[PDB]
Design an enzyme around this catalytic site. Structure first.
Site, PDB file in Angstrom:
ATOM      1  CB  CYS F  15      -1.054  -0.211   1.099  1.00 34.69           C
ATOM      2  SG  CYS F  15      -0.556  -0.027   2.822  1.00 34.69           S
ATOM      3  CG  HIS F 293      -4.264   0.900   4.229  1.00 37.83           C
ATOM      4  ND1 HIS F 293      -3.680   0.034   3.307  1.00 37.83           N
ATOM      5  CD2 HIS F 293      -5.367   1.451   3.672  1.00 37.83           C
ATOM      6  CE1 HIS F 293      -4.439   0.099   2.224  1.00 37.83           C
ATOM      7  NE2 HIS F 293      -5.462   0.942   2.390  1.00 37.83           N
TER       8      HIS F 293
END
Ligand SMILES: [Zn+2]
Ligand SMILES: [Zn+2]
Ligand SMILES: [Zn+2]
Ligand SMILES: [Zn+2]
Ligand SMILES: [Zn+2]
Ligand SMILES: [Zn+2]
Lengths: 331, 328, 319, 323, 339, 337
Positions: F15, F293
């Site tokens: 990510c 994230h």
């Protein structure tokens, strides 16, 4: 039920080095009492950039409470082992380990996780030793103030003499343990202490030369702590292998007079008694660590071999296996 | 240094291996075979069931080091490496078993030293005739120092529940004794092993029985494995029962169904010990030095003088017995 | 650079893969299919037996690089990564097998390019064989079936009953057992010799455009791998397979060698290379990882020959 | 049977770099003879803080005895590979390796494991003759380092530094066990590479190397590789080197020194343009005087006309000790 | 300072599957209350041959106390992750994981680690009520825990032999329902599909006692009794040779008043009305994939979205999507539902 | 599918990479350069500071896939593999930093596309008391004699550094290039406060500056000034602190404009044309603890709408969602006229 403190630690896969160090610290009454009094919560430093967000102090606190509950004969220190492996991965695996290396890590880690100094702030020129030492100690406590400083920190004098300009540099530095060299027939602990304070040619940077020089270095003991940790330098980490000195070092169980090695003539008498010993076995391979420790509640000696705790006699303690000695000052 | 009083360094969870190795080291017919150093002609490098002679060679090299009298301890690095290469199940950091390694090693050494270069390939007849036949057939496939030292014969009788008797004589190189379902005698475990216990593909009925074991012939070195470990879904359990076993004069004649057989009296030479119960666990060994007759405790790299009164405890896991041979 | 004369870099014990890839690279019906670049409509991404079209895509990409004429060598990183992801057994520095990778790739390419989107579930030999082939293509229809698939007859004779049970089964390569210098025809004869409890005899019914002949040199024993070093004599040109074909009404089967997967190394990990005939200039080359050098026919037949690739002569019309 | 020394080494997964270096050392007769004489046991140094407790010398001796027994056509150097990866884990990786890097490790390793100096005990000579200062430097080197490695591979080179301000000429004598030669920029001869190594570098003082004394076995490393941040570069230049009669006497500064004529005994070769690459060796068998090509487990007869190629990376030369 | 239960779980490297399952269990009030009230301590079974020596129950108890203390907004479940990996190493890989697989492991683990039974000790032509009562009592003589009391229901299995036509009826316990999806669908269609008769396939034939032969018998499920907490698993995944497939079908399920009474074959049974309390969500299809959770906080009645360490207020209109993988329902036990 | 509205599959903790890649993808001068497909002549395979052109080639291939309009999402396998091969620190399941990847990629792309085939050496003039305009022009020209690429043309600027010794009072002025600005956050704040904090004089702490007159490491005062700004201004909000045993994160909401960021008041050079910037992309971070994230906001160059890129998922966004504590790296595009 089980007597408090007579609690073995389960080996979780080459963690005997950790267990040994932990048994020595567990039987350090000023440190165990601090955690069992359970008021240390206000002193946990979670923002310290040099600490482990209070997590090493918390896992240690939890473990000691288990070891001193009197409910278990042994506990598996899984949370503690996990936390150590997470912050210091060099202590995980199945290669040769060092109870002293882990001890040094833990003493520093507990200190920063319990450091009362929330914001750390940031030269002996023929001035009296008493003046320079007082200054060095006060400056040390302006950066470092914890139960670890109060229990294990002492002060030593360092004298460095440059071979080029002959300039004598005197500094006062704190210590939380003493690494004693062994002489190169058994030897006495006092011979090892005398060897630590004898002058030796090294390389450090001279302020006048501005270069690195092979200067002479002499140590002197200035002030000693409540708990004196004596590391007998048995191991030599060579490029491709680790060497071990098997010399029998004779050390007192009771009445160790440190006063003759203290260069401060105005200092208080320093008489110490043994409270714990970290032992090492194994000339070849991974080796194994155990501990002798005196239980603070009944005054008897015990052997802690991972999960196994057995009653010991004083005549068994002084052997070639003795590696790290814990001494408590008689106040 | 006294030959054979050599500790073995732990190379990371290798106590299981060191314990087994100390027992085998102190098996005089096996050590003498390698020290005589004439076994080179017997190394079988083409055997499809062996390890190209490499397990025999790594073991020979280690034994020579252990019995040279030059070292107090050795790190068995080449041996550990070779074991891990051929049997990777012994190289993890999970709980191991000194008996599992022993069974692997006894089979591996046998195949690497099997004199049979090409392996070839009953009903109402007397036991003596069938047993002689089974043994001769065994040595036509398997002839080595392992067969000569550790192999015995056991009689297996299976009775069909529908058509009502199949007798077979099978070789063994160790005895796995079940412990009763606390102090028990070794003889009770032997009796338990030979008692008929109902559970086999029958040929007469074909509807797939009352199995019974009997001891027919016993070897020079009788390896007695006490079945302490059981395997639960998520963890391994251990029986901590004290099994009482003799140090001297184990009379196995008592359990041998061949009444024309030679007397079988054994003396203890080594014990593989285990400590830890249901936790991580650790293995050591007791062994009697063949040259001075004294008992020693081998705890990885550490070798210390032992006394007979320490040997019989709950820690005893694998027992090594040597047969008394006076013109038999 | 001449197209197809492209070496493959070794990415750490991957010579087994490069050897296999050079034999497939020099299988003209397969390379032409990818260079034609119309295969995109045939990529099967939902096949439960495939790799979501990803092995076909990684292979197509690499073949286009190898036949571009722009590079003397390429590092097949994407291909190696995709193989290692779907078949992790092909990862490491242990002894490897170029036939094991070949069998994986032939099956993988077939499933990733399978035109069958939903797999369904006393007569003369000609009738039963036609039925068996049609049923096989109702489950399996791809460029791999069209190039490499053959059919063999299995005759099972039951004792006490004497019942003769005949089945026709497909193949994409032939694993030939070696006897005990031997001829390839001796290894074929050994494969077709007769061996509930019944006798089993293989017979060749129909043979493909590209015949892959695997010489069973390796024996995987419990603790080690054995290798047969026997010199197998095989033709470079004019391999007549017709004498081993049990269909007497069948077309003649004459093959010519197009590639060889070679193995060297008596002890250790060993090394794989390849001989291959370039389809554009008709010359033989030796592919040793990144190195491509001109070869001579007199070098091809040695003990090093492990997997042989043969192309059928479809010159004269037969049936 | 099999001719002694004509023994291939199995590849144990990216170990060709190791095999190549090992074939060059195997065919260094003063070193192999030392181990085959089997009296070196008294010289194994197990306490040396710079050694590997004698274990690299012991693993090497065991392997050399196998390679020169005449019983095997090839051996898998498993014990040796294991011991190397234990003491030097950088060689037990899976990435591109360097046969010279392994050679330097092994030459130092063998020296320390066989060092006769059980207890190891920067001096500048002011206006003293070169002969006096060089003799002193060599004697001081042998007071710390005394082994079959020093006796076989060690030479001495002169280092001259001259200040552009005060014109002070500072001379030092330093030992070497191999020569790393830079290749020119913009087919070259070996003598051009040697001359380049001994030419004065402007560097704030000027620095010049000179060869003072040369060993029985002269190891010449051709600096082909450049280790850049993200990739390794390689010079593919053909360096022409003599097979027989290399006259080194012209580069030797001690004008009172003995003649120095060398003959090639082994070459470490490197191939591969895109990936992990591959190492092999040429070596002259000491018993029959013929050239062989060692490609891991494979040993094949070679000819002199095959040795000099762009593949030549490390050259081993043996001095003529005619008188 | 933080509302109890509104605690995110840090991702410790591919552990979203674990965080998702844990958020569903955390918001199962009968289970969390059991640990917070310290009712678990005396019931930890350490010798159970089917358990993990009480260690999974202890690690779970410790974590749930942290999540419900009101002291932390998020915690890293390191001890729990370590203990899980140690006993079930399949959950520590970097390969694709399944929150239902972790859930099934944890429900069995906690049951055995907290099993009150310290020593574990045909039914033909008889009425269903008699056979079911017997099956439940026999179950509790072996299995007696907070897991049995919270999640265990009973289903009827009818097996019919194609040769002798023998009808074999058994009552078996369940702690969750794995529902097959049809080949937008309603949850009731999936339930009906689970209870429709199917013919057995190989290699799981039913051993017929009359034939004394393995048979391709017909198998039909029926719901007999339902638990306080009904865990409904929508079978979205298919494990193929080289990859895992996923059904992206939108399954419409109620947020409130799910009437299960129409699928219960016991006609004398109590009414079964359920309200959703938690959802394990999955995104990514055949790619890597990520797990999250929807959960209703028991103290304030609001819906929250738990995305690893992140906890944010949710709305009911977000809950029913193709992302729904595992549904947690809580039975209504008011004066309206007497037996 | 609309070109550029292409998600990137997560390939196991990637990510951080996808977020940085979405920001770069929506940097129109850089994407246009690769889509124009004439960059092949500029690939530098011999550069000792590059990756033999392989990072540029893997990036070019990926950007062409993302802007083809054929896929809703792509798995950047070749790109991830090449990154992991040259920079192994970016592989694994530990905490990652999208800016650390960005800095790596901006340097790698520059070296792989560097027009300077042979980097020269020339002494940096004393630049003592001479006008700032003269010294800055010299510094920029010397920079371009070593570094000339689409990366220099798109992202490079120049900043002034003034160092004052506490012993000899020597004032050392230098001009150095930058391809992004790391802004410190005050110990809700405005972006202008972080810019002002970046140009405030600070005293170097326990990292001293080497003094030429003293010939010793001195704890001198250091002051930054912005001299020239690029077409694409990458603003890195310094949220993370990498301590010995743990990573700290500042959760402060930094208010930044979506449109009309006037940089002219922070530029110490007055001969420059006004500097007005508009936001084109944001790299976002979530996860107070654990691995965390990364996602991205980006404005599509073809339709002018804002989108949210959460790995494989691309969804229509609104401007009112962009300014949050999650904003970590801001991409600004200069208004040309
Ligand atoms: Zn000085
Ligand atoms: Zn029967
Ligand atoms: Zn029949
Ligand atoms: Zn000068
Ligand atoms: Zn039936
Ligand atoms: Zn200054």
């Amino acid at each position: 039920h089980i007597q408090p403190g007579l609690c073995g630690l389960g080996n979780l896969g080459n963690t005997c080095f950790m267990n040994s160090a932990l048994q020595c610290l567990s039987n350090t009454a000023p440190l165990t009492d601090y955690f069992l009094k359970d008021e240390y919560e206000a002193e946990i430093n979670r923002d310290n950039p040099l600490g482990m967000k209070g997590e090493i102090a918390e896992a240690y606190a939890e473990l000691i409470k288990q070891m001193w509950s009197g409910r278990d004969a042994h506990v598996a220190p899984r949370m503690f082992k996990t936390q150590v492996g997470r912050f210091a991965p060099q202590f995980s695996g199945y290669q040769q380990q060092d109870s002293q290396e882990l001890l040094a890590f833990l003493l520093d880690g507990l200190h920063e996780d319990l450091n009362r100094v929330k914001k750390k702030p940031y030269d002996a020129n023929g001035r009296p030793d008493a003046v320079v030492a007082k200054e060095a100690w006060e400056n040390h406590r302006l950066r470092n103030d914890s139960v670890i400083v109060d229990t294990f920190h002492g002060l030593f004098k360092s004298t460095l003499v440059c071979p080029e300009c002959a300039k004598v540099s005197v500094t006062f530095d704190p210590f939380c343990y003493l690494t004693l060299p062994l002489p190169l027939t058994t030897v006495a602990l006092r011979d090892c202490i005398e060897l630590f304070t004898t002058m030796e040619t090294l390389p450090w940077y001279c302020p006048n030369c501005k270069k690195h020089q092979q200067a002479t270095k002499k140590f002197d003991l200035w002030s000693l702590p409540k708990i004196l940790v004596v590391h007998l330098k048995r191991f030599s980490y060579n490029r491709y292998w680790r060497d071990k000195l098997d010399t029998v070092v004779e050390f007192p169980i009771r009445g160790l007079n440190m006063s003759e090695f203290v260069c401060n003539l105005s200092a208080r008498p320093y008489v110490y008694d043994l409270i714990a010993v970290s032992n090492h076995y194994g000339a070849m391979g991974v080796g194994h660590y155990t501990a002798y420790a005196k239980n603070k509640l009944n005054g008897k000696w015990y052997y802690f071999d991972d999960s196994n705790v057995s009653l010991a006699s004083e005549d068994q303690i002084v052997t070639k296996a003795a590696y790290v000695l814990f001494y408590q000052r008689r106040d």
